[PDB]
Structure 1
């Protein structure tokens, strides 16, 4: 049990969207990803807009010159930060892509969950069922989507025993 600067309560801010799909896709994805950890660990969060909350989820169009420019439908889709004094819980989403909620392309729900897990203080895992797996698995089985012992231990080290 050792979370972000020992803080149990983290605030998140939505500063991203999707040009392809509706706003339910992006807003609910961030919250479902944010709360997917809430449904697994006793973490506390709040969604606001002030200026900059703990976790800041922003969009990144082709002018993405902070790490990698737009790649279109490439294998890369997002990047996030966690153990930092400033970049604490901050991520970016490739705007130039087909963000979808049904796995029809760039699953923004799975990606957000994976990005949120990163921002919370976790890196990559090894199990194929793990939400923190280094590969976006085209798993059409959204009825079997869940957290696994692999990523579970990762978030457990953060907010658990």
Structure 2
């Protein structure tokens, strides 16, 4: 007899990602900057490292889409669902999809791409939603303007339980 494979954590510390396409709301550079910083949230507290591929197959494929966009978990237009992501594994594992019916920003206005991406890459690395309202992995958006960013303790303990 056999059981289904997966799912736990990446068996490798050097992971790749690809920005498959881009939102109109921010420049290529601003989007690239936001995702790089979002990955740095996680590499700053684990031995993980992330490299960007410009084409082809990466561990974490990042894309923007609307409504039904190729996984039968359709987005819903402006508001509501902002994004979703899949835990470590083959094919779709690690991938992160952002709803391009939202207004994405580098500010306290609209929805901050960096912060939402940071949350989603938590999923990409194997974290489900936290019940701690102060956690990055809490499923309610409450990002504010100032000042710097610190990964809350709940998320630090969660990610470090997987990757040390």
Per the shorter chain, which TM-score range? 0.7 to 0.9
Structure ranking higher on relative contact order (CA contacts 8 Å, 6+ apart)? 1
User: 2:9 aligns to what?
Assistant: 3
Q: Distance in 2 between matches of 1:142 and 1:117?
A: 22
TM-score normalised over the length of structure 2: 0.86
Q: Distance in 2 between matches of 1:124 and 1:144?
A: 23
- From 84, 87, 102, the equivalent of 2:89 is 84
Q: Distance in 2 between matches of 1:45 and 1:83?
A: 14
TM-score normalised over the length of structure 1: 0.87
Unaligned 5+ segments in structure 1 are none
User: 1:58 aligns to what?
Assistant: 63
User: 2:25 aligns to what?
Assistant: 20
Cα deviation, 1:82-136, whole Å, max 9, x if unaligned, reads 1332222111111122001112112111110011111011111122331111111
Q: Distance in 2 between matches of 1:123 and 1:88?
A: 14
User: 2:157 aligns to what?
Assistant: 153
Alignment of 1:11-160 (within 5 A): 11-64=16-69, 66-137=71-142, 139-160=143-164
Q: Distance in 2 between matches of 1:82 and 1:69?
A: 18
Paired residue total? 157
Q: Distance in 2 between matches of 1:25 and 1:129?
A: 27
Unaligned 5+ segments in structure 2 are 1-7
Q: Distance in 2 between matches of 1:110 and 1:9?
A: 22
CA RMSD of aligned residues (A): 1.8
Secondary structure of the structure 1 residue equivalent to 2:80: coil
Does structure 2 retain, via aligned residues, the 8 Å contact 1:16–1:26?
Answer: no
Segments of 4+ in structure 1 off by > 4 A?
none
Does structure 2 retain, via aligned residues, the 8 Å contact 1:129–1:146?
Answer: no
1:20 to 1:45, Cα distance in 2 relative to 1, 3 A? closer
Does structure 2 retain, via aligned residues, the 8 Å contact 1:17–1:27?
Answer: no
Secondary structure of the structure 2 residue equivalent to 1:37: helix
